[PDB]
Structure 1
Amino acid sequence: STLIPPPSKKQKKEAQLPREVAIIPKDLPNVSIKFQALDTGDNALRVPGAISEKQLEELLNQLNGTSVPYTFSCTIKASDPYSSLIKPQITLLYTPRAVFKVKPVTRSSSAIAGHGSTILCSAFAPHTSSRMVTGAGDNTARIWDCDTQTPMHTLKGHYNWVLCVSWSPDGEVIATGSMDNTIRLWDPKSGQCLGDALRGHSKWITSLSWEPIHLVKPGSKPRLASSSKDGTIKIWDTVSRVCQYTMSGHTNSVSCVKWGGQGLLYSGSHDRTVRVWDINSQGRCINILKSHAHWVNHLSLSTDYALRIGAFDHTGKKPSTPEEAQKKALENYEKICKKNGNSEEMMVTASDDYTMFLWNPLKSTKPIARMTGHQKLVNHVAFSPDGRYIVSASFDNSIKLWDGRDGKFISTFRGHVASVYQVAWSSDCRLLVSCSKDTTLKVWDVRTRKLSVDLPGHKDEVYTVDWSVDGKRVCSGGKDKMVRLWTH
């Protein structure tokens, strides 16, 4: 056990001597200050003293007649995010705080002796985090009651590995793509395959993309899009299980596909090509992007997170009728999508060649920015739920953060010692949890880009992790054949 060099006699003498105090009640300095919304709104000039931050925050409330708390920052070289006011004209800025705060996950929990196989995938349910499902090498998928940390009915029916599993955004039907050729449907309480499995696929399923609720009309169930090594994406009707059309534009395996809020299915493929297929176009490609040196390994969008919740916000209150649920999904999608006034769902594509590309599929095919600061392939790239921050995981043992819109580099984490696998985003964007080839789980504080806490315990090869929608609990899984839960 290495020891940090102990403080010398000089350090002891310095520590023994008292120093300044933080009461700061007297002689508050006054300097001119300006207010300007972080995104677009430029403005409320004042020259106040070194007053408490709460007073400054409440000052802007009456200006806009909102009563809502707003996150505050200034000088956006300085990069400054009484203590802040004593550093020196400071140009202050504001943005919504999203008062709902997800408490940091620090405490571990006992393991569950469920399916005896390496874990492959896992995802939290949108309606409530109390239920969770994990995929593993075993052909059978199992749901878990997070409250009691116990398994649920076993999804018997598959004869090969369940590559991908995830709840539908409405939570009505779970999809569990099988390795061999098929995807099966399981409602939360069926305990058995719901009808005949979706078959007729030449190769294994790579990823699944549910139809967003905000686009789903009342009554009709959401469509289920699938991707596979065959290089084609089939659109499946959850009710009739029939395929309306299949697109084979991709000449190689489709790495992943995301059902955008505008009805466009942004997908990447091993052919180093990105094709924006759209359901509304009767299964036709509207535009094609080709800028990656290597193939595309992952895809993500700013509004993708809002799709997976299916109007089930952090409160977890289930809607009454499909129409009001769709309306609440649409309003939330507009809120997240219309961050910069207009609805613009930014897209980012992960390139294995130590590079990532920022894309705006709704506009010209010229890339917005070429995010390129990694040393190894970026395994996973995901937009922040807020949308202003972008993070990526790579095999180079580091996690890099980038600006959501301008592409400017922000910071890089180096806590992980081995290859970093997929990561998860907190419901409030305040904390990011990442898992790596190393047998450790870590969470990073976005507020200052510092290591918050370490969560070891897994035997080895923690392949994937997810964050609950409400943020109460965080699940994990790895090759140890043991599911472990984490909570504040």
Structure 2
Amino acid sequence: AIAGHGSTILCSAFAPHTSSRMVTGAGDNTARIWDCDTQTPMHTLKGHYNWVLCVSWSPDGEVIATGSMDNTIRLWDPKSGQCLGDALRGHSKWITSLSWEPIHLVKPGSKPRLASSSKDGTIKIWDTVSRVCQYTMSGHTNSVSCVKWGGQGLLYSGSHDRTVRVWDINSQGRCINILKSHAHWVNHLSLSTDYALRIGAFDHTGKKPSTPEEAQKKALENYEKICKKNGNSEEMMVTASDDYTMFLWNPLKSTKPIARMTGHQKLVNHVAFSPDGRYIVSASFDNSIKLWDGRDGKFISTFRGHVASVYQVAWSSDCRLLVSCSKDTTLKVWDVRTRKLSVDLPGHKDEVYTVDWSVDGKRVCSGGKDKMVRLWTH
């Protein structure tokens, strides 16, 4: 439990290379990097005129992107704490999501691009080095909820228009498919591989590549490690919406859902594949968390114990445990093998808005309406 934020915390993320570094965003228009070894602040990121809504590390660990209510995006250096230039303008409403291009589809010695979605129904591709809007993906007729840069050169966006759109980065922003199965606001979106996409060339030990060539190697190595289970690369996608349901996809392979996984009694606000894509877990406003099979999408078990709406879930690296935050101020980490609660955590005094597992599975962070960051260590 460490202070240092003047407003309610809205987001957080651990470093893809170490469990000692964590960035976070609040409504005090600032962001902060932390030392998880000493539980103390490190840097303060300033230059935003409004709430910092979402933060996203770079899969190489060199750059920190940040999205805000002020319709702009800022890139930062995690060690120095300096803004790497002027803001990234061209959005007319607030930023909803950030998605980085994975290292394996990125040339060695070169830096990965950045994708951002907004309430303006568009998604802009930025050049992090040259600082410019390379592409502007538009076509959604309502707010875009979430965007994910797939490890196969495709970007998937979900929106309030009950539609999930697929974008091709190898065709310079061309839209190749438009998925229409949902019947309400698509709230979130998770890929079977976005753990590998997030950590790029790093691993569970934190071993860094010695040369940009090695980074190009391990990036494709870690990605093929997971997306291949039959002999060829296959990445899956789950969507969550306000129609109480979810859909499993193999979008490139087929424009039609693999399964319609149903059973939640209220809207599904968050969904997350396992780090190995084996399980699927969904958090909903009916105070429940349901567990599904990552391969075919069959219902497995229900996680019970929350008294209020569940806001978000985060997977541990060992694919056995997972942590959740809810409106009822508490954090709970569940065990997939016992299909029930592992240990209950001393939670906050108010609503908890964000959680995260460290990549090595050592520490767990959280923050919310009481303006206080909390760190838990397994």
By the TM > 0.5 criterion, same fold? yes
Q: 1:288 to 1:457 in 2, by over 3 A?
A: closer
Query: Contact 2:18 / 2:359 at 8 angstroms: preserved in 1?
Result: yes
What CA distance in whole angstroms lies between the structure 2 residues aligned with 1:265 and 1:312? 22
Per-residue CA deviations over 1:382-408 (Å, capped at 9, x if unaligned) read 111121111000000110001112221
What CA distance in whole angstroms lies between the structure 1 residues aligned with 2:297 and 2:30? 42
What CA distance in whole angstroms lies between the structure 2 residues aligned with 1:279 and 1:408? 32
**1:399 is aligned to 2:289:** yes
Query: Contact 2:304 / 2:340 at 8 angstroms: preserved in 1?
Result: no
Q: Secondary structure at the match of 1:456?
A: coil
Q: 1:416 to 1:233 in 2, by over 3 A?
A: same
Match of 1:436 among 298, 305, 326: 326
Shift of 1:469: 0.4
Q: Secondary structure at the match of 1:324?
A: helix
Larger of the two Rg values belongs to structure: 1
Shift of 1:192: 2.1
Q: Secondary structure at the match of 1:201?
A: coil
Please give the TM-score of this superposition, normalised by the length of structure 2.
0.98
Per-residue CA deviations over 1:306-330 (Å, capped at 9, x if unaligned) read 1001211110011111111111010
Per-residue CA deviations over 1:441-472 (Å, capped at 9, x if unaligned) read 11111112011110023111011100000111
Shift of 1:209: 0.2
- Give the corresponding residue for 2:56: 166
Match of 1:176 among 66, 86, 98: 66
What CA distance in whole angstroms lies between the structure 1 residues aligned with 2:150 and 2:168? 9
Shift of 1:297: 0.7
Query: Contact 2:200 / 2:222 at 8 angstroms: preserved in 1?
Result: no
What CA distance in whole angstroms lies between the structure 2 residues aligned with 1:435 and 1:191? 29
**1:252 is aligned to 2:116:** no
What CA distance in whole angstroms lies between the structure 1 residues aligned with 2:308 and 2:49? 33
**1:262 is aligned to 2:155:** no
Aligned ranges 1:57-68 → 2 under 5 Å? none
What CA distance in whole angstroms lies between the structure 1 residues aligned with 2:200 and 2:233? 18
Corresponding pairs, count: 378
What CA distance in whole angstroms lies between the structure 2 residues aligned with 1:280 and 1:264? 8
Query: Contact 1:344 / 1:362 at 8 angstroms: preserved in 2?
Result: no
CA RMSD across the alignment: 0.9
Match of 2:19 among 129, 133, 140: 129
Query: Contact 2:24 / 2:31 at 8 angstroms: preserved in 1?
Result: yes
Q: Secondary structure at the match of 1:304?
A: coil
**Structure 1 residues without counterparts, runs of 5 or longer:** 1-110
Per-residue CA deviations over 1:85-127 (Å, capped at 9, x if unaligned) read xxxxxxxxxxxxxxxxxxxxxxxxxx21201210000000001
Shift of 1:340: 2.7
Shift of 1:156: 1.3
Query: Contact 1:124 / 1:166 at 8 angstroms: preserved in 2?
Result: no
Per-residue CA deviations over 1:196-240 (Å, capped at 9, x if unaligned) read 111121111110000101111112210000000000100000001
Q: Secondary structure at the match of 1:480?
A: coil
Query: Contact 1:439 / 1:456 at 8 angstroms: preserved in 2?
Result: no
Identity of aligned residues (%): 100
Q: Secondary structure at the match of 2:352?
A: coil
Q: Secondary structure at the match of 1:366?
A: strand
Query: Contact 2:186 / 2:241 at 8 angstroms: preserved in 1?
Result: yes
What CA distance in whole angstroms lies between the structure 2 residues aligned with 1:293 and 1:122? 30
What CA distance in whole angstroms lies between the structure 1 residues aligned with 2:79 and 2:222? 28
Query: Contact 1:157 / 1:192 at 8 angstroms: preserved in 2?
Result: no
Query: Contact 1:212 / 1:307 at 8 angstroms: preserved in 2?
Result: yes
- Give the corresponding residue for 1:418: 308
What CA distance in whole angstroms lies between the structure 2 residues aligned with 1:364 and 1:406? 14
Query: Contact 1:351 / 1:357 at 8 angstroms: preserved in 2?
Result: no
Query: Contact 2:2 / 2:40 at 8 angstroms: preserved in 1?
Result: yes
What CA distance in whole angstroms lies between the structure 1 residues aligned with 2:67 and 2:298? 37
Shift of 1:427: 0.6
**1:478 is aligned to 2:368:** yes
Aligned ranges 1:44-193 → 2 under 5 Å? 111-193=1-83
Q: Secondary structure at the match of 1:280?
A: helix
Please give the TM-score of this superposition, normalised by the length of structure 1.
0.76
Shift of 1:295: 2.1
Q: Secondary structure at the match of 1:214?
A: helix
Shift of 1:190: 2.4
Query: Contact 1:236 / 1:242 at 8 angstroms: preserved in 2?
Result: yes
- Give the corresponding residue for 1:465: 355
Shift of 1:274: 1.3
Shift of 1:364: 2.1
Query: Contact 2:331 / 2:346 at 8 angstroms: preserved in 1?
Result: yes
